[PDB]
């Protein structure tokens, strides 16, 4: 288990998002889905010069899996995924050029759904999630898991669970008062609102253990 610190601006934003109120916290789903689509875009781009790269899965898509038992909403894509370095760099440690700008707009009163515009729309998941786990697998590396509950740091281990062919899985351990987003009905409407121009298939798998 490795522990890493967040780049100071990202760490600062996370604390702003967590502690500020918005009437409007569901744009986080738009964001993780946009991310997934870009990942899909990416592996698709790579495969145009090398078919073999799709030997870890020909289908390109996004699943949504609300789990009420475990109070977790999961977003899964068979996209490009991340190598270990990719994971450590892109989910906290390297400065994103839009972080400052976005914090100023928030200051000026900008609504939170602006966040997509600044390339930091992932950290919006912490509007609804006390904890986030990202499990990723890239053709060029083994499978890893990234964890953070904010508070300045994240961790990275290898993940032993169910091997993905390829892609990324963002698991949201929801806050107590954010459980409406496990509601099938709530997820139907949200996708229909913020994600009707996503060029990949999106399926809703409702998970319940017996
Ligand atoms: N679903 C999903 N997949 C991926 C990523 C994210 C993501 C996360 Cl978890 C957190 C944040 Cl802050 C942003 C994110 O994405 C922004 C769009 C990235 C783009 F998709 F364009 F690659 N989310 C990141 N990834 C890589 O960096 N891959 C390396 C490119 C070489 C392999 C795959």
From Swiss-Prot:
Changes after translation: ISGylated.
Record-listed ATP binding positions: 35, 77, 96, 122
Domain of life, per lineage: Eukaryota
Region (Interaction with NR3C1): 1-209
Coiled-coil residue windows: none
Residues modified to N6-acetyllysine: 42, 68
Cell compartments where the protein resides: Nucleus; Cytoplasm; Melanosome; Cell membrane
Function as written in the Swiss-Prot or TrEMBL entry: Molecular chaperone that promotes the maturation, structural maintenance and proper regulation of specific target proteins involved for instance in cell cycle control and signal transduction. Undergoes a functional cycle that is linked to its ATPase activity which is essential for its chaperone activity. This cycle probably induces conformational changes in the client proteins, thereby causing their activation. Interacts dynamically with various co-chaperones that modulate its substrate recognition, ATPase cycle and chaperone function.
Free-text note on domains in this protein's UniProt record: The TPR repeat-binding motif mediates interaction with TPR repeat-containing proteins like the co-chaperone STUB1.
Family assignment from sequence similarity: Belongs to the heat shock protein 90 family.
Subunit and partners: Homodimer. Identified in NR3C1/GCR steroid receptor-chaperone complexes formed at least by NR3C1, HSP90AA1 and a variety of proteins containing TPR repeats such as FKBP4, FKBP5, PPID, PPP5C or STIP1. Forms a complex containing HSP90AA1, TSC1 and TSC2; TSC1 is required to recruit TCS2 to the complex. The closed form interacts (via the middle domain and TPR repeat-binding motif) with co-chaperone TSC1 (via C-terminus). Interacts with TOM34. Interacts with TERT; the interaction, together with PTGES3, is required for correct assembly and stabilization of the TERT holoenzyme complex. (Microbial infection) Interacts with herpes simplex virus 1 protein US11; this interaction inhibits TBK1-induced interferon production.
Protein name: Heat shock protein HSP 90-alpha
Species whose genome carries this gene: Homo sapiens (Human)
Shown chain mapped onto the complete sequence: 17 to 225 of 732
């Amino acid at each position: 288990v490795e522990t890493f610190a967040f780049q100071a601006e990202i760490a600062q934003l996370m604390s702003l998002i967590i502690n500020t109120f918005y009437s409007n916290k569901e744009i986080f789903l738009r964001e993780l889905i946009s991310n997934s689509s870009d990942a899909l875009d990416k592996i698709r781009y790579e495969s145009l010069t090398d078919p073999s790269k799709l030997d870890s899965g020909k289908e390109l898509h996004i699943n949504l899996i609300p789990n009420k038992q475990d109070r977790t909403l999961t977003i899964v894509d068979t996209g490009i995924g991340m190598t270990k370095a990719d994971l450590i760099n892109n989910l906290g440690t390297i400065a994103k050029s839009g972080t400052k700008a976005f914090m100023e707009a928030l200051q000026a009163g900008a609504d939170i759904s602006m966040i997509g515009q600044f390339g930091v729309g992932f950290y919006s998941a912490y509007l609804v999630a006390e904890k986030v786990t990202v499990i990723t697998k890239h053709n060029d590396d083994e499978q890893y898991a990234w964890e953070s509950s904010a508070g300045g740091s994240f961790t990275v281990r290898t993940d032993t669970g169910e091997p993905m062919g390829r892609g990324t899985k963002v698991i949201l351990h929801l806050k107590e008062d954010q459980t409406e987003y496990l509601e099938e009905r709530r997820i139907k409407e949200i996708v229909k609102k913020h994600s009707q121009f996503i060029g990949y298939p999106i399926t809703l798998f409702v998970e319940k253990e017996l």
